[PDB]
Every structure is written in C-alpha cells, then in structure tokens.
Design a protein around this ligand. Structure first.
Ligand SMILES: [Mg+2]
Ligand SMILES: [Mg+2]
Ligand SMILES: [Mg+2]
Ligand SMILES: [Mg+2]
Ligand SMILES: [Mg+2]
Ligand SMILES: [Mg+2]
Ligand SMILES: [Mg+2]
Ligand SMILES: [Mg+2]
Ligand SMILES: [Mg+2]
Ligand SMILES: [Mg+2]
Lengths: 113, 151, 261
RNA sequence: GAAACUGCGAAUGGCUCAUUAAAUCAGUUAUAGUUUGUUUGAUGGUACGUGCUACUCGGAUAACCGUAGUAAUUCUAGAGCU
RNA sequence: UGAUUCAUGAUAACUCGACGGAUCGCACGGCCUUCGUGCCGGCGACGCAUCAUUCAAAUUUCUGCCCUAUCAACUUUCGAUGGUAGGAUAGGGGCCUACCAUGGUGGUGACGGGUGACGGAGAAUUAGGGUUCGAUUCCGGAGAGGGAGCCUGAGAAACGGCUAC
C-alpha cells in the first residue's frame, strides 16, 4: 500500500500550474518510479492528460519506506512546452536531443569570409 | 610581367602576358592612375588609352598611391583602406604592413589596368504623430506653469 | 579595475537579502535604478526567493517577459531591477498588491495592501531648488524629480504621490512630533515619534525618537523617514507595528506560544 | 532565414603576488576640486522668414559576381551590381 | 547651505555649434473637405541634448605597519618647500613653464638598508596578558616575458588590441 501526500503546495497563475512536495509512503516497497507517481497523481488531480505532470529531485529517506520530491502539475500541453526546461520534457518524452564537437563549432568558421 | 585587363563600361575582364623589353619602356617609371598610351603596349592598343591602377607583385604586395619609390616600404595604415582590410580586427586597430611603391617598375609582377577610351501613409502618420506630441508638450507647459502661477 | 564591475559575489551581497552562502558563487547584482542597490530588493528575490513563484533564474525571466509584474505603476521587465522601500509591486493577473516595508530586524518585507492603497506612495524629498528658466523642482530619494512643487515643501520632508496622476496630493513637514520609520543603521524597521533634533554645524544632524511602547533611541537625519502627521501614520504597518523588542521578549513569545500548541 | 553592413559587448570575469614599507591598505573624511555609456524621473520652439506659424531629397560600399598574385595568414590588388 | 561673487534671472556680444527625429513595428477605425490609405489619431521600438538619480571612478583628510644607528644628517643648480601668473587635465595641486623667496624632514628616528614583505577581513596556539602567521576562493591594489608609447571607446595606458626596442 502506497500513499501520496503533497505539502507546501500552491497554484500560481503566473506560470499557470501548481507546485507541491510529494511525500509518498511505501512500506514494503523499495521506491516508487516516477511514471507510476505520474499515473497515481493523475487520479487525485484528474488531469485529463498525464503528460503535464512532472516529478523530480527524489531522495528516498534513510531507513526506507519514505520518499520525498518535487511535483509540478500544469494545465496545458502548451504551458508545459513553454514553461518547462528541455531536458525535463525529454525525460517525459516530448522532445529529442543533440550533442557537440567544439573544434570548428565556430573556430575555423571565424576565418574564411 | 602579367596584366589584368578589364573594362567597366561593358563589364569584361581577362588577363594577358608580355615579356618584351621595348614593349614596356613607357609602362615603367610611371604611377597608378596615370594615363598610358596603348601605342607602346602594341599595335593592338591604339585608340585604347589605358588607365593603370593597382596590381600586386611577387610575394603578393600591392602598391600604394603616394609612395613614390619602387621600394618595399613599411607603413602603419588604418583598417579599411587599400592594402589593409583586416577582418575581426577591433575598430581602432592599425598595422604596419609592407607595400610596394606607386611607380611601376621591373620588380612588380602583375598590373591591373582598365580602358579609359576605346578605339506613403506610414511616414505621414509618423510625422503627424511627432507634430501632435510637439504641440502637446507646450500644451502641458501652459497648463502646468499656470497652475503654479496663481499661488 | 579598468571599468565598472558587473558581478556581485554571493558573500558580498547585502546581508538582509538572506542569501545562503553555498547556493552559488554569484548574487544578482542589482542594476542601476531608483535605489542604491545596497538598500534595494531586486525582482529576482521578490519572485524566486520570497514569494516562491519561481524555482530558478530562468523562470523569473519567463515571468517577466510576460509582463505580469508591475512596479509602482509601470511594468518592469528587467530582472535585477532595484525595487526599494515603499515601492508597490502589483500582479494584476493574480490581483495582488504589496508595499515594500521594513521589519524590525532590518529586512524587507512585502506587506499586502489593498487596491485603494496601491495607487499612491510616499516619498521623501532630497532637496528643492530652481532649474532652467527659474522653474523650481524637487528631488526625491528614489530618483523622481517633480517640477512646480508647493512652495512650502522643503528638504527632508515627505510627500504623497498618486501613481495615476503622478503629481503631489499631500505632504508632511519634517519636524518634531511626527511618526517616522528608520531606514538605516541598527534601528531600521523601528517606527517612532520624533522627540528631539540636535543640530551640529558641519556634521550630520541627529534625531532622538521615542517608541509608542516607551523605548527611546536615536539615529541620524538621513536614516529617518516620516510616515504620518501626528501620532497616526498614513500607511499600513507590518506583522509587528514597528516595535523592536529584546531577545528575551521573543524567547518569552515562543515559549508562551508553545503552551497553546 | 544563412551570409554581410550597422549596432553593442569584449575595460567585467579568471590567474598570479613580481614590484611596492605613510606607499598600498583599514577605519574615518572631502569634492564649494571633477568625470560617469547605462538605469530611473523630469525636461526640449526660432534651423531662418527682410523672426509676420516650416522652404528638398545625395553618392558609394560589402554580402554577391568575376580576373589574380604570393610558399604563406580572417595577407592582399582591380572590375560589375545594390 | 555650517559656509559661496550659490541655485537662478537680466543684459551685451561671440562661435566657422557636438544639438534640436528624412528611422522602424504591429494595430486598425471614428468621421468626409475633392468622399480621393481621404481629415485624423493611438499603443510601442530605436535614437539626439540637458538636469537630477543610480552604477562607479579619480583625487583626497586624520590615525595606524615588521627588523636595522656597524644608516645622522637628507632634499635643494636639474622641483627640493612656498608665492604670483600661466599651460595642461575631467578637475584640485610644482603636475609642468617663467619669475621670486629660502625653505621642507629629522633621537617623537628623517634619509638609507633588509625583507625568503601585496595590505586587510582573518589563521594557529591560546587561564589572563601574549607569540607567530596571513601566496590562496571576500574586499582593496598591482601585473600579463622586461621596459616604453598609443588607437578605439563612456570607461584601457588594454596585452585571449596595436607600435617600437
Ligand atoms: Mg579583474
Ligand atoms: Mg545586473
Ligand atoms: Mg604655484
Ligand atoms: Mg593654478
Ligand atoms: Mg614579494
Ligand atoms: Mg612568493
Ligand atoms: Mg583579489
Ligand atoms: Mg593592467
Ligand atoms: Mg612566464
Ligand atoms: Mg600593455
């Protein structure tokens, strides 16, 4: 039996979302995966879309059976695309990534024209 | 030793070769922009009057106007002018560069010459907005100086 | 240095910002504005730190680029903008209004006010003198210059300034017998009443003040800011009505409040 | 939208402690002895008309296109555009 | 204003005047005088000049620094101390020039020498008093192989700028 218990929770209309601290209790479990946290949270806050939900910074207290972390529930897909960093969306599966190589990334382009 | 020929009046350009002494007596000992009679360059140039201006030498150093010596001088010249066009170079930067003198001589490699003679509502709205603000500045004046005047 | 400095290292930031010393190497470095950057509170701290409306640097920027926050009547999108004492911060999107006022411990607090008491501020005059073409004008201590003032307003006095019409609507004559809130030194935050002023030719003038609960103290002229005429102040006071107390008083406050819980 | 002109920035940051012993530096002053891009607030008539309510529109240069030099470089010359 | 021939106003002239908008975005939206992008008129962006403010700098007052006398005189023609008039500077000022006076510091340690000496906040040990340390992350200064000179710029005597040795 896992429970979910959010604190310090406030809805802001500036970024059109609501922020909170998740304090999941899981006696007997190791920890709750963020995907399952996503699903469970959707059915206490009835979001119609489980992609506007974001969770991060989880700790898993010493001694086990307790985990805390930060949770963001949006109200749009648009708001989640504008008000969220790219890597977080990549983690939730709404984007894709790239890499770098620094020689000639600008250096020899400096010097031709 | 070589010469690039071009004409702007039509828009053509090409380069040719000469290595004849007497073909180039009236080519030497003369300066950029100086008119040269084509008669010496050959019989293929009468009617043509050539205007020589520019053309680097071996080592690729150009000439500069006003250095009246077929030498290789070292001038400290500002950015943007002829013979120094440095890019990514911090406005205010100057360089001492090596350039050859203005007087055509043997030491030069290629000459560049050409052929002198051949053988709305928006703006009006903006203007009246500026005027309509210039007027109301003095409207505000005569309003605000007088409310203080009677005290 | 060969010019102006643009970074503020975190240990060099003002102590009343309450920035934690391990939270990075740099601090927001307030931009130039209407307050002296050692007595201001930039917008980054108002949004991210105090109000917890944003969690990071870039979230504050995302808030400001959207023109929500309004400072003293205009929308200020600069992120290190130096908001200061007695300014108004307004978020119309949430319909919420704050006056920046001190607390007894010397730290800025956002005291919520109503919409009626957000169209005006008070401002202390730096000086009055003539300008081009004999026109008189007065200086405030937050940059504002007003021309054609009431010919009675002298330096160090207080003025009420409506944010709508942007002109004066009333003023308080700095003198003995008015309530004043201290804005510098160790006594910042404490309100009181001017009881004495002693002049010293060639130095700073010193003010002697007496709190409503009897405690007597003193400051210098530059650090005193009159609030109201007579004993009644014209603006709201924060959680403590500007009354300093000893450490033992608040120890008693905690333990006495620890018996009802 | 790339490139390029224009603007801005590159005088901050980072590193080190050689020189330096009323020097630097610290607390404390002063500018009625000055400069200050920028921010913020306020402000702005007459240019000629013999002050009698405003009086006309330039050429030239990159990106481009093309002929080269030099062993060589964000070394460089000449021509056609805008 | 502690204190000004202060702020500021009037007047007479001067200058080969840095200046006083030939710029750019969406929005539309009242109404005819040729019913003609028609008369308008907005919200913004950028930019010019002045004052004040802010971000600062530069000079600057008083007091304070280790060891050394086997370092007692030092500075002064050539700026050493002061005066007048200038020049220069953003500005005060021997900063520099001309002229004039003969000063200025010193056993309360000048001047010189050592420092394996950047100063401070601080560090170690500490009954108390002390002793020793502080190149190093904060503040201030200084330098970019050694000197020197500069351009650009609001700001540099810049070095991931230039010029010379
Ligand atoms: Mg530095
Ligand atoms: Mg800043
Ligand atoms: Mg003198
Ligand atoms: Mg003088
Ligand atoms: Mg040393
Ligand atoms: Mg060393
Ligand atoms: Mg340092
Ligand atoms: Mg340096
Ligand atoms: Mg080395
Ligand atoms: Mg240098």
């Amino acid at each position: 039996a896992v429970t979910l218990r959010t604190r310090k929770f406030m809805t802001n209309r500036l970024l059109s979302r609501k922020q909170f601290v998740l304090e999941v209790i899981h006696p007997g479990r190791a920890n709750v995966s963020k995907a399952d946290l996503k699903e469970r949270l959707a059915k206490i806050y009835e979001v119609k879309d489980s992609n506007c939900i974001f969770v991060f910074k989880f700790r898993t207290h010493f001694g086990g059976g307790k985990s805390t972390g930060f949770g963001l529930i949006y109200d749009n897909l648009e708001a989640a695309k504008k008000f969220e960093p790219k890597y977080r969306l990549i983690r939730n599966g709404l984007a894709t990534k790239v890499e770098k190589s620094r020689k000639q990334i600008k250096e020899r382009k400096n010097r031709t024209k | 030793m070589k010469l690039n020929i071009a004409n702007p009046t039509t828009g053509c350009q090409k380069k040719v070769e000469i290595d004849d002494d007497m073909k180039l007596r009236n080519l030497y000992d003369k300066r950029i922009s100086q008119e040269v009679v084509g008669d010496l360059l050959g019989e293929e140039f009468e009617g043509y009057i050539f205007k020589i201006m520019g053309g680097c030498d071996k080592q690729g150093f150009p000439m500069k106007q006003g250095v009246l010596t077929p030498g290789r001088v070292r001038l400290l010249l500002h950015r943007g002018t002829s013979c120094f066009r440095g890019h990514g170079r911090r406005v205010g930067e100057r360089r001492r560069k090596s350039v050859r003198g203005c007087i055509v001589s043997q030491d030069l490699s290629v000459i560049n010459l050409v052929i002198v003679k051949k053988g709305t509502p928006l703006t009006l709205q903006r203007k009246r907005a500026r005027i309509a603000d210039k007027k109301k500045r003095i409207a505000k004046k005569k309003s605000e100086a007088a409310e203080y005047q009677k005290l | 240095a060969r010019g102006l400095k643009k970074h503020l290292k975190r240990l060099n930031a003002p102590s009343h910002w309450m920035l934690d010393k391990l939270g990075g190497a740099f601090a927001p470095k307030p931009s130039s504005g209407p307050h002296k950057a050692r007595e201001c509170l930039p917008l980054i701290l108002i949004l991210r730190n105090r109000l917890k409306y944003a969690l990071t640097y870039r979230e504050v920027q995302s808030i400001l680029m959207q023109r929500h926050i309004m400072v003293d009547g205009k929308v200020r999108t600069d992120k290190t903008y130096p908001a200061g004492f007695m300014d108004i911060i307004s978020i119309p999107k949430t319909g919420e209004n704050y006056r920046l006022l001190y607390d007894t411990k010397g730290r800025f607090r956002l005291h919520s006010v109503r919409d009626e008491d957000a169209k005006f501020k008070l401002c202390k005059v730096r000086s009055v003198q003539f300008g081009q073409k004999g026109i008189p004008y007065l200086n405030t201590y937050d940059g504002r210059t007003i021309r054609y003032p009431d010919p009675l307003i002298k330096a160090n006095d207080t003025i009420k300034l409506d944010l709508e019409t942007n002109k004066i609507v009333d003023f308080i004559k700095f003198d003995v017998g008015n309530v004043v809130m201290v804005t510098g030194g160790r006594n910042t935050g404490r309100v009181g009443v001017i009881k004495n002023r002693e002049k010293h030719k060639g130095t700073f003038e010193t003010i002697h003040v007496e709190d409503a609960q009897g405690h007597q103290f003193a400051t210098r002229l530059g650090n005193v800011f009159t609030i109201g005429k007579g004993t009644k102040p014209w603006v709201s006071l924060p959680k403590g009505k500007g009354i300093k107390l000893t450490i033992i008083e608040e120890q008693r406050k905690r333990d006495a409040a620890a018996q009802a819980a």
